[PDB]
Amino acid sequence: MIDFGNFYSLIAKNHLSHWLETLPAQIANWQREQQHGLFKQWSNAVEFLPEIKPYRLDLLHSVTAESEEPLSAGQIKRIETLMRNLMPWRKGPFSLYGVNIDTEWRSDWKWDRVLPHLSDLTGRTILDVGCGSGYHMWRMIGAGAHLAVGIDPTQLFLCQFEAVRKLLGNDQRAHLLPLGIEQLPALKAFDTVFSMGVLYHRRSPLEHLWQLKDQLVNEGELVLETLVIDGDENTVLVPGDRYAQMRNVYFIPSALALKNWLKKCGFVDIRIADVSVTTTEEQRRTEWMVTESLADFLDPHDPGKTVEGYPAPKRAVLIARKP
Numbered sequence: 001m002i003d004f005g006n007f008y009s010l011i012a013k014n015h016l017s018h019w020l021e022t023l024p025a026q027i028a029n030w031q032r033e034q035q036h037g038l039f040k041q042w043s044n045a046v047e048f049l050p051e052i053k054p055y056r057l058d059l060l061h062s063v064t065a066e067s068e069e070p071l072s073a074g075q076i077k078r079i080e081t082l083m084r085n086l087m088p089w090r091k092g093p094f095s096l097y098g099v100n101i102d103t104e105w106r107s108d109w110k111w112d113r114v115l116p117h118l119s120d121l122t123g124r125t126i127l128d129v130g131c132g133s134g135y136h137m138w139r140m141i142g143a144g145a146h147l148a149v150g151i152d153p154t155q156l157f158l159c160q161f162e163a164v165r166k167l168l169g170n171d172q173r174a175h176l177l178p179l180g181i182e183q184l185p186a187l188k189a190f191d192t193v194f195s196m197g198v199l200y201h202r203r204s205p206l207e208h209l210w211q212l213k214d215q216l217v218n219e220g221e222l223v224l225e226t227l228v229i230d231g232d233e234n235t236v237l238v239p240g241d242r243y244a245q246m247r248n249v250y251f252i253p254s255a256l257a258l259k260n261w262l263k264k265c266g267f268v269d270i271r272i273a274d275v276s277v278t279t280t281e282e283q284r285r286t287e288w289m290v291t292e293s294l295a296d297f298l299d300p301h302d303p304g305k306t307v308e309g310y311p312a313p314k315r316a317v318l319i320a321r322k323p
């Protein structure tokens, strides 16, 4: 069982301290709920990895760690084998002492779409909602953030993040908590909040936006990214049982529509920063994710479309300020 003492101890002494009124209880419950099918294999992976202080660390242009002298083939195999047990690796990539984890997504491409539109991350305390493996949190550190907190109620992604953290010298500037966004009170304590790929999984989209607002300090920045379709303010798709084979997909608004929803929920200075079709170069099967992926979710004879007939995945980035 993973110990969140470090995190509690950290926030006890800073401006997130009020989170202790709820968090440890929620984490404890989550820890009892847990017997995942494969939980042992995942947590053994983390336990049996070596703690290594990177000699060189790049978080600015990637997430890459190197040692002073190359590791032995056996040291490298031990790492690779153990990381290979945390498959499927979806968000990345990571390059760790020569072990190159090529993840389903080019999460770097998203980061590059986003960065040019952000307020300076330098010194900020940040929340990443549905952070996955935690890739982006490391980039946020790389880009100057003081503290990066992620939440994702998936167990595998917690083990992934802690595996990476161990190999980055047990770095204490990022943390992943296994909560859902629904579980948080109104912390009003983060300078910048990210929600990327989460809105379309929420039954109530406006309440998601209000819940994100509730986590920001005044003058804070929201970074919102999700599936969209083309059209005006009033154009919004709600698909059936499956969209691109995903099961519980609710609102896929246009960017213009989503801009309006943000105004509804009381944000200002709202900008549509980037709109982009997801290509099978951004999302695809790799040696580190070997089940189905985007190519399988598209219409075989028309990539303009999903396998079900809907317009194909298309993603938008919006930035806003909380007044």
Ligand SMILES: Nc1ncnc2c1ncn2[C@@H]1O[C@H](C[S@+](CC[C@H]([NH3+])C(=O)[O-])CC(=O)[O-])[C@@H](O)[C@H]1O
Pocket (backbone or CB within 6 Å): 091, 105, 107, 110, 129, 130, 131, 132, 133, 151, 152, 153, 154, 157, 179, 180, 181, 182, 195, 196, 197, 198, 201, 225
């Ligand atoms: N209730 C929830 N609260 C917080 N997270 C959730 C919740 N439910 C599911 N998620 C998580 O949201 C992530 C979905 S991906 C975005 C990853 C990254 N942010 C990216 O921008 O690529 C989808 C995509 O790639 O479009 C997964 O990690 C889910 O476990």
